[PDB]
Structure 1
Amino acid sequence: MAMKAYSMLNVTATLDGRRVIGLMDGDDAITTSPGVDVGTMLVGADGSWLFSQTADKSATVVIKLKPNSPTHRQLTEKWMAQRAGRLVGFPFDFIDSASNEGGTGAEFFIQKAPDDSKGNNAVVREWTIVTGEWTPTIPTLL
């Protein structure tokens, strides 16, 4: 079980049961960022210090898809479902098999929508999703 080379052929992402397939080119196709800073250091006028830790365990994820990808169809159906009035979680979770690095969430929600650009060639479609809780998994294989 040697720590093999990194490859996109071992990263798996699941969005409400079905997989994510059509991804745009680039070094950043699925990016997750935390909500706020972990903490804040406050230093007074005398030199003492006090650290404050937040309770906000939330994250956002950005997915970049080609204009022709079944995940795009699934997401554009979910967006219309939200617009109609129905509101549900559709859990999303992704992981790398080489080092067990990644995370999972229980209830996400569509936060942004892509811009439909036609032009002369294909263009990215970016979706931004937001969770209320986000649990990373500890990479046990280093």
Structure 2
Amino acid sequence: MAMKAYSMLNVTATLDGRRVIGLMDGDDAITTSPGVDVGTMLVGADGSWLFSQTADKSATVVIKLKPNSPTHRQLTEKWMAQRAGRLVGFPFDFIDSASNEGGTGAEFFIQKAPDDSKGNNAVVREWTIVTGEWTPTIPTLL
């Protein structure tokens, strides 16, 4: 079970059951960030201290797409479904087969919609989705 070097050919992302396909160029095409800081240190006037840990386990992910990708059509249909008043979960999941690093979330929602720029060359379309519960997977292959 040799440790495969990194490659985007071996990363898979699944949005509502379908694959994510037409991604923009760059080192940051799918990025997930936790919602808050894990904890806070409180130091008093005497030198004693107290740590406090949060119970909030939430995250956002940002997906950068090309103007010609089926995932853009899927996300723009989901946006219109939300605008109509139909509010459901739509899971998102992605993982790397080389290291088993990734995470899952069983209920996501659209948070930001992209800007439609036409101009002279084609440009990015950035979507943002948010969940209330994100559990990272343990990389068991280091």
- When normalised by structure 1's length, the TM-score is 0.99
- 1:72 partner SS: helix
- 2:139 partner SS: coil
- 2:52 partner SS: strand
CA deviation string 1:32-75 (max 9, x = no partner):
00000000000000000000000000000000000000000000
Indicate the residue corresponding to 1:83 in structure 2: 83
1:134 aligns with 2:137: no
Indicate the residue corresponding to 1:101 in structure 2: 101
Rounded to whole Å, the distance in 2 between the matches of 1:52 and 1:70 is: 44
| Deviation of the 1:103 alpha carbon | 0.2
Rounded to whole Å, the distance in 2 between the matches of 1:50 and 1:75 is: 44
| Deviation of the 1:4 alpha carbon | 1.3
Rounded to whole Å, the distance in 2 between the matches of 1:97 and 1:20 is: 16
Q: Unaligned 5+ residue runs, structure 1?
A: none
| Deviation of the 1:113 alpha carbon | 0.2
| Deviation of the 1:24 alpha carbon | 0.0
Indicate the residue corresponding to 1:73 in structure 2: 73
- After TM superposition, the runs of 4+ consecutive aligned structure 1 residues lying more than 2 A away are none
Rounded to whole Å, the distance in 1 between the matches of 2:135 and 2:41 is: 25
- 2:42 partner SS: strand
- 2:55 partner SS: coil
| Deviation of the 1:84 alpha carbon | 0.4
Rounded to whole Å, the distance in 1 between the matches of 2:34 and 2:136 is: 11
CA deviation string 1:61-107 (max 9, x = no partner):
00000000000000000000000000000000000000000000010
Indicate the residue corresponding to 1:13 in structure 2: 13
- 1:104 partner SS: strand
Indicate the residue corresponding to 1:27 in structure 2: 27
| Deviation of the 1:2 alpha carbon | 1.1
Rounded to whole Å, the distance in 1 between the matches of 2:114 and 2:133 is: 24
Rounded to whole Å, the distance in 2 between the matches of 1:71 and 1:41 is: 42
Indicate the residue corresponding to 1:43 in structure 2: 43
Rounded to whole Å, the distance in 2 between the matches of 1:135 and 1:122 is: 35
- 1:6 partner SS: coil
| Deviation of the 1:30 alpha carbon | 0.1
- When normalised by structure 2's length, the TM-score is 0.99
| Deviation of the 1:9 alpha carbon | 0.3
